[PDB]
Amino acid sequence: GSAKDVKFGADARALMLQGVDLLADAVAVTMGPKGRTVIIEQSWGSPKVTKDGVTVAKSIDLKDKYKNIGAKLVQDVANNTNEEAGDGTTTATVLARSIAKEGFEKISKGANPVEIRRGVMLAVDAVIAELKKQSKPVTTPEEIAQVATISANGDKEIGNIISDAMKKVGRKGVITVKDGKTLNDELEIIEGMKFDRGYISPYFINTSKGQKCEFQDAYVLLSEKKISSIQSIVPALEIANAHRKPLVIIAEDVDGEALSTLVLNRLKVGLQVVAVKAPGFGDNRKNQLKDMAIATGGAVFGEEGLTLNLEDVQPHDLGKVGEVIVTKDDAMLLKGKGDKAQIEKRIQEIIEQLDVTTSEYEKEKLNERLAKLSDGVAVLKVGGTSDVEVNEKKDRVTDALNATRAAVEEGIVLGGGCALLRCIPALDSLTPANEDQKIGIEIIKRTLKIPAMTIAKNAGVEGSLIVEKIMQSSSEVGYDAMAGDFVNMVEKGIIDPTKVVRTALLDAAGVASLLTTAEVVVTEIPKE
Amino acid sequence: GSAKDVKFGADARALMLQGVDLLADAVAVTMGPKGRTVIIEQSWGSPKVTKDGVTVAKSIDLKDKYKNIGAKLVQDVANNTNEEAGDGTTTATVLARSIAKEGFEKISKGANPVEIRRGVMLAVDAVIAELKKQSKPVTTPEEIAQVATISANGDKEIGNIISDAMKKVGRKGVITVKDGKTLNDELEIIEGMKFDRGYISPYFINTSKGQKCEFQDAYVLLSEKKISSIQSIVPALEIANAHRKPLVIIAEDVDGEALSTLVLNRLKVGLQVVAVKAPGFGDNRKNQLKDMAIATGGAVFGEEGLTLNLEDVQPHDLGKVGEVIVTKDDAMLLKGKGDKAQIEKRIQEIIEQLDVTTSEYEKEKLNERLAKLSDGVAVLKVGGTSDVEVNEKKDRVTDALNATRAAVEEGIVLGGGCALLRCIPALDSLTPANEDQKIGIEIIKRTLKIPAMTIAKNAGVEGSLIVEKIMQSSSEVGYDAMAGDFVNMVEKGIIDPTKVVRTALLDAAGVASLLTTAEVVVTEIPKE
Amino acid sequence: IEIIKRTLKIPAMTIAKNAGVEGSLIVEKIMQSSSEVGYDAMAGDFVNMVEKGIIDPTKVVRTALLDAAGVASLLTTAEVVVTEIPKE
Ligand SMILES: Nc1ncnc2c1ncn2[C@@H]1O[C@H](COP(=O)(O)OP(=O)(O)O)[C@@H](O)[C@H]1O
Ligand SMILES: Nc1ncnc2c1ncn2[C@@H]1O[C@H](COP(=O)(O)OP(=O)(O)O)[C@@H](O)[C@H]1O
Ligand SMILES: [Mg+2]
Ligand SMILES: [Mg+2]
Hints:
EC number (chains A, B): 5.6.1.7
Subcellular location (chains A, B): Mitochondrion matrix
Number of domains of chain A: 3
Number of strands of chain A: 17
Radius of gyration of chain A: 30 Å
CATH superfamily of the largest domain in chain A: GroEL-like equatorial domain
Bound molecules: adenosine-5'-diphosphate, magnesium ion
Keywords (chains A, B): Acetylation, ATP-binding, Chaperone, Disease variant, Hereditary spastic paraplegia, Host-virus interaction, Isomerase, Isopeptide bond, Leukodystrophy, Mitochondrion, Neurodegeneration, Nucleotide-binding, Phosphoprotein, Transit peptide, Ubl conjugation
CATH class of the largest domain in chain A: Mainly Alpha
CATH architecture of the largest domain in chain A: Orthogonal Bundle
Strand content of chain A: 5-15%
Shape of chain A: elongated
Oligomer: part of a larger assembly
Protein name (chains A, B): 60 kDa heat shock protein, mitochondrial
Largest sheet of chain A: 6 strands, mixed
Helix content of chain A: 40-55%
Distance between the termini of chain A: 17 Å
Structural class of chain A: alpha+beta
GO molecular function, one term (chains A, B): unfolded protein binding
């Protein structure tokens, strides 16, 4: 194989701890208010200016192999916390460094690091079982705004924007962030059924306005496969002209022959029609056209095992929509007379379909179909002047959004580190089975103080003194590091998701208590 | 990944500030009259000789990684200002260096850089809200000449040329600058409907002059697709010969058969005809031929839905034009009897079509159609003797043109830096919420003096003394650095667009106040 | 004469500079003021001098000016410089 190099004991431990200390000192400055950004050189363009604890962690890679091992084992913690909770990365990294440092001190010749790991895991379980006891659900719409404000680095505009977007879409709706172009932030609630696809021929525009085809009380002809010939298209247009109502033709495509017939009828005698293609690549459109049909009320033509053809249509076989807008890039149906008692059955079908499976993309478009059929979708356009500002503010907005979505499902708990400091009395009743589990419980009991200490440190005050005066205080009092004083929390409005706190703690403890059990380190020699 | 290197605190700040200072000292010499060019080595040919603050900024790239980070964060400022306003790059870069320098001095252990950023942004908002109050619209045609003269580095010929081009085309017309060939500048006003495409066969020339086909009161046959056979071409020529008038044949192309028929009828019986291909290369031609038709009055043949076959034409189906000139590379129709009441509807259609969308190329050809259909288009052929002279003078002309186009939409304000010096009393009423926002407001209050100071510095006098004696003076008095004395501004004729001033200030403040919040810098190893 | 007229402003400028303020602005506002008014860089404001108690010997001022001007105006007259090689 490749020439390798082994290091034993305290040397390898010291190098791994140096790497962890470097990668955790680079990120620990970002914590809390008064924390500070980190400029990462991008290999091609302008650099990133971050405050998150994964970009700062996923970027830092060390030259030395052992320091690099430490850096990788901390990046694993940061990335696991990011994926599992969306937030809690800096806290996870500082907890990991604390458990690693406290781990490479009790490893004597008689100490059993595996039993120390077992004690650490008992302590982590006993503390995440206390977080769930001191937690409380988020009910009022002010708590959502508060969580969004806090997780947005104290940006109250972000909090109000996210709270508004969650009031008009639902606490489990579909909010999404985009690179805005204006100077401020904007909340755009796409309402009704909208798909990113416009009319085919630019002759259907009857608006004398901003390039729109606008219909009221229109019919809908939903075709799965192409409408090629003049034969298939004529009966639907006959029905439309006889009833004297506009017609939208949502199909896979309108061939040049039927297209020519439609445009011809438009420019002369003036049947009111407009045509558009399907929303989704192959399979998604198959379900999405059916959703549109049952939302407006009708039948998709050309289905595989249904045997419905265009040649035999009827006025009760076409969908009915109150208002239709078709621009050059997107079509919006608004008021579908689609027998709500059945669209509700469809909604139950799709919610069960999400509850069954998960692929991070099937569930994505699945939730898209929920929101596109029940209550809109919100989009947050982040204001900014350059790309680096927009990227930083968009990262903060996505973090606040992940936090607000992690609070509504698993409750809130006190913030500023107090959620963990208020769990030390839980560890003070554990009876360790032996000396090693006692050592692990003590490691966790020390590590639970790291977050409040690091926040007070970044605030420019003495951390340990603040943590002590907090633990001496009541249960609802703690430290506001912006005002810099002791306040009630829920009255003042500092809270955090229990999910993010518990996932950060658990991931940090898990990776660090396994790093601390090492005795030999094997690294490939660097050739050049 | 790649082996990286992290630097913390004052070291990283010092290196990034060195990079910013280098990239801003290279560009600060270019400011104002008495400012000086910069010779940039081109990798392939003769070097550039610039005075703009983006070529000098986009060129400079530093060896060291941290200096390079500073240089990139200043290039972003210059480039954003260039894209958003077309001018204001040197000012934006000097403001960015001032804000960065004033930012890397107040960062003590207790100072909160994010609150300093917030205070800086409040100050920038309060000052751009004062620029808009002390502004005033540009109304007389002498203010346009003045703005063009000033932004052209005080070249009055450029100002008069741009003012003339804007009087004969409209303040929102289509002016464009080209590399001239003569020694002087030239204003060429392409009038009527002209497209860069000449006759097909060199037998239609009936001029006995400079290779031109010249018709008076001619018919126009507009065909979307090719005219292949003699069958389709014969009836139009029958109508033309019967009425005894010339005929122009604007089609996608003239096949060899109809072409041979045309050339034969031209050479043997001397029938007056001339043929040309369509102007638009692709989809654009389908709209441009329709525009030409409605401008002259007729129907484009071969349209998809408006079938209108060539075989059934009539004398009212052909366009009519007063004068036609067709050379070997361009055709010009001049006086189209096109029922102006309908071409006005077309103009409204195309103006709404620009108001709807934006792609930097669809809007480009869109405005091209507006100008080519309403009041022609002006071109500015810049003189010069070598390519480097022509390039420098062309850059100055494009900057003067961008300035004049940014002044006519958002008003003018005093110049020489006085626009910003007259905004400090606005900052003198801000009540900062805390100490950090107060620090930010003070940073902006110091930064607002940088432009007048740098101009007086380049003029060879004491900057700060000039700025002080300006602030002591009245509201309309300021410093003329060419005459070198204090004068009224609008009376003497120094003004700048409020858009360029506000965009430069806002972009500089935005990028600099985010650079100043950094605590750690991560850069890839320079390996080789 | 113009070189000396520019050089006479250097001391007040350097004092205002070390005090953390703008030197040239202070020198200008001093030259605009009366003959007994000047700048106190500790209190940082304009005061009468003998009333406030700032004075210097004319001997030290004149000797400093004369020695500086003398050596500098001879340094500025050079055209060639000859230096021993730095061998090792
Ligand atoms: N005013 C505040 N006072 C005390 N703690 C705060 C305050 N604002 C935010 N925090 C705490 O800082 C953390 C949120 O920001 P941050 O330090 O970046 O953590 P993360 O890396 O997980 O996003 C939470 O622990 C939060 O409770
Ligand atoms: N005679 C003048 N006197 C004072 N300021 C002037 C004069 N001419 C131009 N300026 C100022 O110089 C700037 C225009 O040229 P320049 O310094 O290169 O700025 P930019 O890089 O944005 O083009 C403006 O601030 C303008 O007000
Ligand atoms: Mg967070
Ligand atoms: Mg300019």
